[PDB]
DNA sequence: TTGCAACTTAAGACTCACTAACCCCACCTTATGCGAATAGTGTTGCTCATTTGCTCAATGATG
């Protein structure tokens, strides 16, 4: 279990540049920036929880959906 | 001679600036879909308190 968590932390630590890169889009919707980066961090955590590698795709395309889920979810109910 | 307290200078952060009044305008938005859950609300059979109209009931005042 601890080994698996080390792997998952390691992957998240890889994909932070992805999450700020997508985080540039929806900035000025009446919320602050680091709220977006943290929500997106949650979203990529969930995307790590739901990714499989034997599918054969690049991780980012699958991850994108969970990130927009977290962002648009968060600004949606935090209007 | 060399460290060391002591004095001197400079750099930087914070606070702070009259009193009252009147008039005007400008103010802050984009996934879909699905099921599950929940809140709401709808219906109904059934209470509980509260005001009036009214009757008994007696007792001294009056015929």
UniProtKB/Swiss-Prot annotation:
It is found in: Cytoplasm. Disulfide bonds: none annotated. A motif (Interaction with polymerase core subunit RpoC) lies at residues 35-38. Residues 11-79 are annotated as: Sigma-70 factor domain-2. It comes from the Bacteria. Sigma factors are initiation factors that promote the attachment of RNA polymerase to specific initiation sites and are then released. This sigma factor is the primary sigma factor during exponential growth. Preferentially transcribes genes associated with fast growth, such as ribosomal operons, other protein-synthesis related genes, rRNA- and tRNA-encoding genes and prfB. Contains 4 domains, connected by flexible linkers. In the active conformation, the domains are in an extended conformation, each making extensive interactions with the RNA polymerase catalytic core. Interacts transiently with the RNA polymerase catalytic core formed by RpoA, RpoB, RpoC and RpoZ (2 alpha, 1 beta, 1 beta' and 1 omega subunit) to form the RNA polymerase holoenzyme that can initiate transcription. Identified in a complex containing RpoD, the RNA polymerase subunits RpoA, RpoB and RpoZ, CRP and DNA. Interacts with Rsd; this prevents interaction with the RNA polymerase catalytic core and with promoter DNA, and as a consequence, promotes transcription from promoters that require alternative sigma factors. Belongs to the sigma-70 factor family. RpoD/SigA subfamily. This is RNA polymerase sigma factor RpoD. It comes from Escherichia coli (strain K12).
């Amino acid at each position: 279990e601890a080994k698996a968590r080390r792997a998952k932390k390691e992957m998240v630590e890889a994909n932070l540049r992805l999450v700020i890169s997508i985080a540039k889009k929806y900035t000025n919707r009446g919320l602050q920036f680091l709220d977006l980066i943290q929500e997106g961090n949650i979203g990529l955590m969930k995307a790590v929880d739901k990714f499989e590698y034997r599918r054969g795709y690049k991780f980012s395309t699958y991850a994108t959906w969970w990130i927009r889920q977290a962002i648009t979810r968060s600004i949606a109910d935090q209007a």
